[PDB]
């Protein structure tokens, strides 16, 4: 309504990976055993 025929038609990332990151291995942990074997038990 405002005589704006120019305004009539409008014409116009990887997350990251931490350094600490790592899978827990059965070492550096005093709660459990300290080996990994195929079919021991």
């Amino acid at each position: 309504q405002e005589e704006s025929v120019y305004a009539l038609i409008p014409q116009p990332p990887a997350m990251h990976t931490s350094k600490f990151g790592g899978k827990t291995h059965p070492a550096q942990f005093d709660f459990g055993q300290n080996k990994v074997q195929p079919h021991a038990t």
Binding site: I9, P10, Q11, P12
Partner: protein, 86 residues
């Protein structure tokens, strides 16, 4: 004057008290039309009727009778003394 005309006059009085706001007597999908046009500007896939918008006005009654021409050919009739009509 009578019941029907008094009801008529009261309604007309209401019409005059209210501002007509130069209204268009029909409202179509305003923001939907704007949104569809913006979708067309970039996405380049909009339904045709979604792009469309329709606005009506009163115009007038009296459905375009052809003109009467209000005037003959300036070779037949003359004013009072020789002289065209205007």
């Amino acid at each position: 004057m009578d019941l029907k005309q008094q009801v008529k006059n009261y309604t007309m009085t209401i019409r005059n008290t209210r501002p007509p706001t130069m209204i268009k007597e029909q409202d179509k999908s305003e923001f939907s039309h704007f949104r569809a046009l913006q979708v067309l500007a970039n996405g380049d896939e909009v339904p045709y009727e979604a792009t469309l918008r329709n606005v009506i006005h009163d115009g007038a009654r009296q459905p375009k009778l052809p003109p009467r021409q209000t005037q003959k050919h300036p070779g037949y009739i003359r004013n009072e003394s020789g002289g065209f009509f205007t």
